[PDB]
Scaffold this active site. Structure first.
Site, PDB file in Angstrom:
ATOM      1  N   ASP A  15      -0.389  -5.355   4.678  1.00 58.38           N
ATOM      2  CA  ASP A  15      -0.122  -4.125   4.958  1.00 58.38           C
ATOM      3  C   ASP A  15      -1.117  -3.268   5.764  1.00 58.38           C
ATOM      4  OD1 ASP A  15      -1.818  -3.316   3.182  1.00 58.38           O
ATOM      5  OD2 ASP A  15      -0.407  -2.753   1.609  1.00 58.38           O
ATOM      6  N   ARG A  29      -2.560   1.224   8.437  1.00 64.18           N
ATOM      7  CA  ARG A  29      -1.958   0.829   7.117  1.00 64.18           C
ATOM      8  C   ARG A  29      -0.539   1.188   7.240  1.00 64.18           C
ATOM      9  NH1 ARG A  29       0.349   0.433   2.792  1.00 64.18           N
ATOM     10  NH2 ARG A  29      -0.605   0.251   0.682  1.00 64.18           N
ATOM     11  N   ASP A  34       3.425  -1.561  -0.352  1.00 59.26           N
ATOM     12  CA  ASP A  34       2.332  -2.089  -0.859  1.00 59.26           C
ATOM     13  C   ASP A  34       2.375  -3.537  -0.823  1.00 59.26           C
ATOM     14  OD1 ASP A  34      -0.415  -2.016  -1.884  1.00 59.26           O
ATOM     15  OD2 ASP A  34       0.426  -1.721  -4.029  1.00 59.26           O
ATOM     16  N   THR A  35       1.691  -4.094  -0.282  1.00 60.99           N
ATOM     17  CA  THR A  35       1.626  -5.577  -0.370  1.00 60.99           C
ATOM     18  C   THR A  35       0.695  -5.924  -1.424  1.00 60.99           C
ATOM     19  OG1 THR A  35      -0.148  -5.901   1.443  1.00 60.99           O
ATOM     20  CG2 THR A  35       2.701  -6.276   1.927  1.00 60.99           C
ATOM     21  N   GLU A  37      -2.718  -7.637  -2.949  1.00 56.42           N
ATOM     22  CA  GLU A  37      -4.153  -7.975  -2.116  1.00 56.42           C
ATOM     23  C   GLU A  37      -4.054  -9.310  -1.991  1.00 56.42           C
ATOM     24  OE1 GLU A  37      -6.069  -5.327  -0.901  1.00 56.42           O
ATOM     25  OE2 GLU A  37      -4.926  -3.809  -2.022  1.00 56.42           O
ATOM     26  N   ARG A  75      -7.868   5.377   8.502  1.00 52.65           N
ATOM     27  CA  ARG A  75      -6.731   4.287   8.851  1.00 52.65           C
ATOM     28  C   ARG A  75      -5.474   5.002   9.626  1.00 52.65           C
ATOM     29  NH1 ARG A  75      -5.754   0.744   3.496  1.00 52.65           N
ATOM     30  NH2 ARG A  75      -5.126   2.736   2.880  1.00 52.65           N
TER      31      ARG A  75
HETATM   32  C1  LIG Z   1      -0.035   3.966   2.533  1.00 49.71           C
HETATM   33  C2  LIG Z   1      -0.780   5.119   2.025  1.00 49.71           C
HETATM   34  C3  LIG Z   1      -1.934   4.921   1.502  1.00 49.71           C
HETATM   35  N1  LIG Z   1      -2.916   5.823   1.247  1.00 49.71           N
HETATM   36  C4  LIG Z   1      -4.099   5.754   0.353  1.00 49.71           C
HETATM   37  C5  LIG Z   1      -3.849   6.047  -1.203  1.00 49.71           C
HETATM   38  C6  LIG Z   1      -4.705   4.934  -1.872  1.00 49.71           C
HETATM   39  O1  LIG Z   1      -5.991   5.736  -2.233  1.00 49.71           O
HETATM   40  P1  LIG Z   1      -6.694   4.939  -3.183  1.00 49.71           P
HETATM   41  O2  LIG Z   1      -7.734   3.995  -2.224  1.00 49.71           O
HETATM   42  O3  LIG Z   1      -7.984   5.843  -3.592  1.00 49.71           O
HETATM   43  O4  LIG Z   1      -6.263   3.892  -4.109  1.00 49.71           O
HETATM   44  C7  LIG Z   1      -4.774   3.799  -0.707  1.00 49.71           C
HETATM   45  C8  LIG Z   1      -4.065   2.568  -0.973  1.00 49.71           C
HETATM   46  O5  LIG Z   1      -4.190   1.929   0.229  1.00 49.71           O
HETATM   47  P2  LIG Z   1      -4.319   0.297  -0.257  1.00 49.71           P
HETATM   48  O6  LIG Z   1      -3.014  -0.233  -0.763  1.00 49.71           O
HETATM   49  O7  LIG Z   1      -4.460  -0.360   1.138  1.00 49.71           O
HETATM   50  O8  LIG Z   1      -5.454  -0.135  -1.146  1.00 49.71           O
HETATM   51  O9  LIG Z   1      -4.499   4.314   0.479  1.00 49.71           O
HETATM   52  C9  LIG Z   1      -2.618   7.304   1.590  1.00 49.71           C
HETATM   53  O10 LIG Z   1      -3.372   8.098   1.380  1.00 49.71           O
HETATM   54  N2  LIG Z   1      -1.408   7.625   2.490  1.00 49.71           N
HETATM   55  C10 LIG Z   1      -0.264   6.189   2.517  1.00 49.71           C
HETATM   56  O11 LIG Z   1       0.320   6.763   3.165  1.00 49.71           O
HETATM   57 CA   LIG Z   2      -2.071  -3.244  -0.569  1.00 53.25          CA
END
Ligand SMILES: Cc1cn([C@H]2C[C@H](OP(=O)(O)O)[C@@H](COP(=O)(O)O)O2)c(=O)[nH]c1=O
Ligand SMILES: [Ca+2]
Length: 129
Positions: A15, A29, A34-35, A37, A75
Site C-alpha cells: 500500500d 500511501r 490496509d495491506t 505488512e 506521505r
Molecule cells: C491511509 C491513511 C493512513 N494514515 C496514517 C494512520 C496511521 O497512523 P499510525 O502510524 O499512528 O498507526 C498510519 C497507518 O499507515 P500504515 O498502514 O502504512 O502503517 O497512517 C492517515 O493518517 N490517513 C490515511 O488516509
Molecule cells: Ca499497511
C-alpha cells in the site's frame, strides 16, 4: 476528482509506493486500504501485486481526494492508477487489502471499494480464506 501524472521511482510494499509527482520524489500511501505488512500473512503477496501493477504500467496517475493530501508522515494520500486501473480497488477485490482508514472527507471511492471487498469476501480470496 482528477487524475494527474506521476512516474514510478520504486515499489515499496502493498500500500505504499515511491513516485515522482510534479517533479519531486514522494512516498504515496494508498487511500482507504490496509495491506498486511511484508512480515505478515499475505504481506509478500500484497507487495508483489502492487509492485507488478506499477512496474508494468505504461502510465501511472495519482488522484487526490477532497481532504488532506499528505498524512502526518509526509506521505501523499491518493488513489493510484496503473494504465487506468486503480490499485486501491484492485488490491481489495483480490483479498490482498482490507477497506480501512476511512476518514470523513477523503472517502470518495469508499462505496466502490466496499463493493470490491464484499466480492473478495464472497470468493473467500486470500485474506478472506
Ligand atoms: C491511509 C491513511 C493512513 N494514515 C496514517 C494512520 C496511521 O497512523 P499510525 O502510524 O499512528 O498507526 C498510519 C497507518 O499507515 P500504515 O498502514 O502504512 O502503517 O497512517 C492517515 O493518517 N490517513 C490515511 O488516509
Ligand atoms: Ca499497511
Amino acid at each position: 476528482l482528477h487524475k494527474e501524472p506521476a512516474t514510478l521511482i520504486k515499489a515499496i510494499d502493498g500500500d505504499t509506493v515511491k513516485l515522482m509527482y510534479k517533479g519531486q520524489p514522494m512516498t504515496f500511501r494508498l487511500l482507504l486500504v490496509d495491506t498486511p505488512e511484508f512480515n505478515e500473512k499475505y504481506g509478500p503477496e500484497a507487495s508483489a501485486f502492487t509492485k507488478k501493477m506499477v512496474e508494468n504500467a505504461k502510465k501511472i496517475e495519482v488522484e487526490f481526494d477532497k481532504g488532506q493530501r499528505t498524512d502526518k508522515y509526509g506521505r501523499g494520500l491518493a488513489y493510484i492508477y496503473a494504465d487506468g486501473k486503480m490499485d486501491n480497488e484492485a488490491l481489495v477485490r483480490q483479498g490482498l487489502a482490507k477497506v480501512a482508514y476511512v476518514y470523513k472527507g477523503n472517502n470518495t471511492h469508499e462505496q466502490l471499494l466496499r463493493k470490491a471487498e464484499a466480492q473478495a469476501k464472497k470468493e473467500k480470496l486470500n485474506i478472506w480464506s
